[PDB]
Structure 1
Amino acid sequence: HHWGYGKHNGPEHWHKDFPIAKGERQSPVDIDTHTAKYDPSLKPLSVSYDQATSLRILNNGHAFNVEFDDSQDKAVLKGGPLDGTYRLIQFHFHWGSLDGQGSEHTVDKKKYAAELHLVHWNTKYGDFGKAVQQPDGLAVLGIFLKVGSAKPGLQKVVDVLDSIKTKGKSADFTNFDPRGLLPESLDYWTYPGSLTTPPLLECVTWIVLKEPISVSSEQVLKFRKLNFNGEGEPEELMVDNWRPAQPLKNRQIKASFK
């Protein structure tokens, strides 16, 4: 039927409907820290989120998205390996049924419990659907989540999950500041890739933060309580909504640190 993460519709099946799945700049990939080239020409990232406006949280049946107002340059990313300004449109996570699995990216093959993704489109294209159709369309900043100490800043998110339990639910979600989700350090790896869920377009410049942030077991647990299914359908827990690592092929990973 339609794509998902189950046995019969899992990532191993996406190629049939989205041939791009076997393309050349597919994501995620394994980051090999010894083969990554430190490039001293990469500039520091620029995260301007002091003017962020969250609007809604929504369960889409594949993850939950926190959406922002992108009608104006309010929450932008610039700097790093990027040209022009990338506007914040939404953030969502990928996670697993267990703590030692959940992340999409991997580091020297180590998997983290979740991978937060912040998505931004290149303003040069006028709108997100136009950005997706360009090689330098989007910028995705990725951050790993390790189970440890709680993260105050993620708690407002955890708390509303109860109201968007099933596919199609949404809830007003204003005044959230995504600055609470950032690690102390902004060192990263960069490579040219794609969206990790269909349509798997190769329009992304990935920026993966070296340092992860901590979440308590309890916080992660509440992620594990959402459903894939719509209300009135048999319960399918939302878990393991991560794609496996893809072959790097003709690409280089560049670091912003030594």
Structure 2
Amino acid sequence: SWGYREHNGPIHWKEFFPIADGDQQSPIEIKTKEVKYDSSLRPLSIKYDPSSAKIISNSGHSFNVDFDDTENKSVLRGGPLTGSYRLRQVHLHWGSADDHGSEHIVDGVSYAAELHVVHWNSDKYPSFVEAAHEPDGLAVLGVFLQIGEPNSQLQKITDTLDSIKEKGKQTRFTNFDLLSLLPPSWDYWTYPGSLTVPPLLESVTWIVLKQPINISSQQLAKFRSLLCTAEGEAAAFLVSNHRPPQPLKGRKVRASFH
């Protein structure tokens, strides 16, 4: 029963998941003057199939779009990665205020929100659950959102949120243009880190895009009316679901660009 409320939020997760204080925890502050440009980093290359999307649900912690992941139809390759990382799910983090919702921050600055696209190393591991337990097992693409013109694929998401208000509810969700929630510039920073929710496993190669996309305030506000509580529980709202930046512990953040 972890969450983001006073009694169960990020500062308390260590009481139940001691890896919360680990060597490679996420999110982090990206400090661009300590960032190392690296010419061995490949550009990202992304295959994606809009029919791969299957459903959206309320986890109680965010919404999740899950995708069929039995084939290599939607994959992330290149970047810092060796081999092919199969798309598993997409979700979003925000805060209670439009100007402070992202998980990662860049030189002191937070964004309105931050989209996570989660993939697993199917070249090496048999399942997402098993990859999540290996240092090279997961690759998560992070995209910042700033307040601006409404994104139509974000609108496709927000239009479902009344149908998944309570924790555990879900609904059909396919023909999802995920590539259109990426910015035009695919420059990125990368570092080794973890899930930003319990179990906080240090299995993530983070790939955070420099350029934000746009969401409207109205679109962003709709996420805050999702519940973190289930049908016939006393209602609590998911108004904020971002973890604070965690100690870097000397890890190297590399850039694809200079």
TM tier relative to shorter chain: over 0.9
Q: Secondary structure at the match of 2:160?
A: helix
Q: Structure 1, residues 36-93: CA drift from partner, whole Å, max 9, x if none?
A: 0011110100111146511110111111100000011011000010001000000000
Deviation at 1:15, TM superposition (A): 0.5
Q: Matched residues in 1 for 2:129 and 2:110: separation? A: 31
Q: Matched residues in 2 for 1:109 and 1:75: separation? A: 34
> Which residue of structure 2 lines up, in the alignment, with residue 56 of structure 1?
55
> Which residue of structure 2 lines up, in the alignment, with residue 243 of structure 1?
243
Q: Are the equivalent residues in 2 in contact too, given 1:116–1:142 (CA < 8 A)?
A: yes
Q: Matched residues in 2 for 1:140 and 1:236: separation? A: 28
> Which residue of structure 1 lines up, in the alignment, with residue 167 of structure 2?
167
Q: Secondary structure at the match of 1:125?
A: coil
Q: Are the equivalent residues in 2 in contact too, given 1:45–1:78 (CA < 8 A)?
A: yes
Deviation at 1:234, TM superposition (A): 2.1
- Matched residue count: 257
Q: Structure 1, residues 211-243: CA drift from partner, whole Å, max 9, x if none?
A: 000111111011111111111222211121010
Q: Matched residues in 1 for 2:128 and 2:11: separation? A: 27
List, as ranges, runs of 4+ consecutive aligned residues in structure 1 with deviation greater than 3 Å.
none
Q: Secondary structure at the match of 2:222?
A: helix
Q: Secondary structure at the match of 2:12?
A: helix
Q: Matched residues in 2 for 1:80 and 1:100: separation? A: 29
Q: Report matched runs for 1:182-221 at 5 Å.
A: 182-221=182-221
Q: Secondary structure at the match of 2:159?
A: helix
Q: Structure 1, residues 146-200: CA drift from partner, whole Å, max 9, x if none?
A: 0111111211111011100010101111221211211001000000000000000
Q: Are the equivalent residues in 2 in contact too, given 1:52–1:177 (CA < 8 A)?
A: no
> Which residue of structure 1 lines up, in the alignment, with residue 230 of structure 2?
230
Q: Matched residues in 1 for 2:175 and 2:128: separation? A: 22
Q: Are the equivalent residues in 2 in contact too, given 1:52–1:75 (CA < 8 A)?
A: no
Q: Report matched runs for 1:104-183 at 5 Å.
A: 104-123=103-122, 124-183=124-183
Identity over aligned pairs, percent: 60
Deviation at 1:250, TM superposition (A): 2.6
Q: Secondary structure at the match of 2:191?
A: strand
Q: Matched residues in 1 for 2:229 and 2:257: separation? A: 42
Q: Matched residues in 2 for 1:28 and 1:14: separation? A: 15
Q: TM-score, normalised by structure 2?
A: 0.98
Q: TM-score, normalised by structure 1?
A: 0.98
> Which residue of structure 2 lines up, in the alignment, with residue 9 of structure 1?
8
2:70 maps to 1:68: no
Q: Structure 1, residues 111-136: CA drift from partner, whole Å, max 9, x if none?
A: 11111000000012011111011100
Q: Matched residues in 1 for 2:133 and 2:59: separation? A: 22
Q: Are the equivalent residues in 2 in contact too, given 1:24–1:250 (CA < 8 A)?
A: no
Q: Report matched runs for 1:72-91 at 5 Å.
A: 72-91=71-90
Q: What's the C-alpha RMSD, in Å, of the aligned pairs?
A: 0.9
